[PDB]
Curated annotation (Swiss-Prot), chain A:
Name of the gene encoding the protein in the UniProt record: UBR4
Annotated positions of the Phosphotyrosine modification: Y86
Quaternary structure and partners: Component of the SIFI complex, composed of KCMF1, UBR4 and calmodulin (CALM1, CALM2 or CALM3). Interacts with E2 conjugating enzymes UBE2A and UBE2B. Interacts with RB1. (Microbial infection) Interacts with protein E7 from papilloma virus HPV-16, HPV-6B and HPV-11.
Disease: Episodic ataxia 8: A form of episodic ataxia, a neurologic disorder characterized by episodes of poor coordination and balance. EA8 affected individuals have attacks of unsteadiness, general weakness, and slurred speech. Additional variable features include twitching around the eyes, nystagmus, myokymia, and persistent intention tremor. Inheritance is autosomal dominant.
Reported function: E3 ubiquitin-protein ligase involved in different protein quality control pathways in the cytoplasm. Component of the N-end rule pathway: ubiquitinates proteins bearing specific N-terminal residues that are destabilizing according to the N-end rule, leading to their degradation. Recognizes both type-1 and type-2 N-degrons, containing positively charged amino acids (Arg, Lys and His) and bulky and hydrophobic amino acids, respectively. Does not ubiquitinate proteins that are acetylated at the N-terminus.
UniProt similarity note: Belongs to the UBR4 family.
Name of the molecule in the record: E3 ubiquitin-protein ligase UBR4
Length: 238, 204
């Protein structure tokens, strides 16, 4: 919630010590994510009314951020340095994180009290979170971590790739690609035959297609993030 | 030449394009693109029945076409949809294609299926015959399909199902062309501009 104020994305599990502490907090976090997923499988969010709709989006973007932060912490672990048990725990956490995002998305999409622009804006916010997470995990090095011994996409932007990126990073990345594809297909037709300020980080926020995409472009050099991810993935596969 | 073109056309009238003359039909339409667009000439009957059966047989051959000739057919049908939208927006008595048939030829390209019946086809062929503008060749043909493979990098973007895929690609191409032309909106205007619909519309 502090982040929906365009305060950059600011994952916290990042200092060598903070990542140690969160690996400590990994197992108990799985317990909470699992409980939440089991609960929200029932018609808990049936009447998606703006009011409730806000909380429904809140919880979804909440696991999204929790998962991206766990991914960034695993990135610090592999870059800076029962271990297998904790690794499995964090994998399960990120998986259920994406799963809850998808569930709330489909709920807002097929709802009769939510959807359309509301669903589009939920997709926009999810894509924002995922892309910012990808950027943070990509641009962390042993050097930076050791020097630190609360990443800011804007901090890195003003300061200005390989390592940190892993299998959980692949997951968040595929999901971000799905969401970006969706927003860009929207922008096509919108500009039917070729046919404002950046979209606010809020579900009901009203914005044009170009705007949602401008907010997703003002948060990360997008071309850069994407091509960097391509290169890194290709290299790691090789 | 126009004669020889209506010619592979009626040789197909004899039977489903051998797709050996298709590479000729795509050629004709692409170049005669401007002629059909806004001729506004007594040739209306001829050019229009031309456009009609041309759409018909190109729609007949979507399941299987040479990748490159696939691209060719795609371009030809984009042109066809363009002209059909034009006619629908600009209803003309001299046009020998009814808006009902016109919309069906457009849906036909979009659905990778042609609904016209044999009798309609024969009427068209009849009108065509009655209204007819009333080695090096292969070289030029390939040079052209090449200037096309060069400037335009098509993306499939996804042997028994291959034909279906080809049809799917063709269908997507038609839809894309329609959107590029903004024909969907044009069609909307046409629908809302129906003669009998207006009455109930106002009443409602």
């Amino acid at each position: 919630q502090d982040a929906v104020l365009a305060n950059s994305f600011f994952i916290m599990p990042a200092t060598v010590a903070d990542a140690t502490a969160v690996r400590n907090g990994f197992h108990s976090l799985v317990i909470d994510v699992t409980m939440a997923l089991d609960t929200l499988s029932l018609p808990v969010l049936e009447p998606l009314n703006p009011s409730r709709l806000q909380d429904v989006t809140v919880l979804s973007l909440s696991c999204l951020y929790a998962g991206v932060s766990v991914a960034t912490c695993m990135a610090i672990l592999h870059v800076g340095s029962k271990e297998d048990d904790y690794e499995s725990d964090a994998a399960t956490i990120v998986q259920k994180c994406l799963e809850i995002y998808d569930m709330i998305g489909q709920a807002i999409s097929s709802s009769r009290r939510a959807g359309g622009e509301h669903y589009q804006n939920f997709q926009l916010l999810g894509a924002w979170c995922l892309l910012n997470s990808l950027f943070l995990i990509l641009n962390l090095s042993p050097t930076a971590l050791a020097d630190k011994g609360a990443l800011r996409v804007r901090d890195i932007l003003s300061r200005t790739g390989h390592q940190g990126f892993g299998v959980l990073s692949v997951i968040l990345a595929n999901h971000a690609i799905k969401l970006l594809t969706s927003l860009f297909q929207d922008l096509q037709v919108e500009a039917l035959h070729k046919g404002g300020p950046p979209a606010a980080l809020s579900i009901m926020a009203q914005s044009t297609s170009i705007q949602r995409i401008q907010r997703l472009i003002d948060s990360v050099p997008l071309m850069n993030l994407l091509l960097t991810l391509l290169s890194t993935s290709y290299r790691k596969a090789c | 030449g126009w004669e020889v073109a209506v010619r592979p056309l009626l040789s197909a009238s004899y039977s489903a394009f051998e797709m050996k003359e298709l590479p000729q039909l795509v050629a004709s339409v692409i170049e005669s693109e401007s002629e059909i667009l806004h001729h506004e000439k007594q040739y209306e009957p001829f050019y229009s029945s031309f456009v009609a059966l041309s759409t018909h047989y190109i729609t007949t051959v979507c399941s299987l076409i040479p990748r490159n000739q696939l691209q060719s057919v795609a371009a030809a049908c984009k042109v066809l949809i363009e002209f059909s939208l034009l006619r629908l927006e600009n209803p003309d008595e001299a046009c020998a294609v009814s808006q009902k048939h016109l919309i069906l030829l457009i849906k036909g390209l979009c659905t990778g299926c042609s609904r016209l019946d044999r009798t309609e086809i024969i009427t068209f062929t009849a009108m065509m015959k009655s209204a007819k503008l009333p080695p090096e060749l292969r070289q030029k043909e390939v040079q052209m399909n090449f200037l096309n493979q060069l400037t335009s990098v098509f993306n499939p973007r996804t042997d028994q199902a291959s034909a279906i895929k080809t049809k799917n690609v063709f269908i997507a191409q038609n839809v894309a062309s329609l959107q590029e032309l903004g024909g969907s909106e044009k069609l909307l205007r046409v629908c809302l501009n129906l003669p009998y619909f207006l009455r109930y519309i106002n009443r409602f």
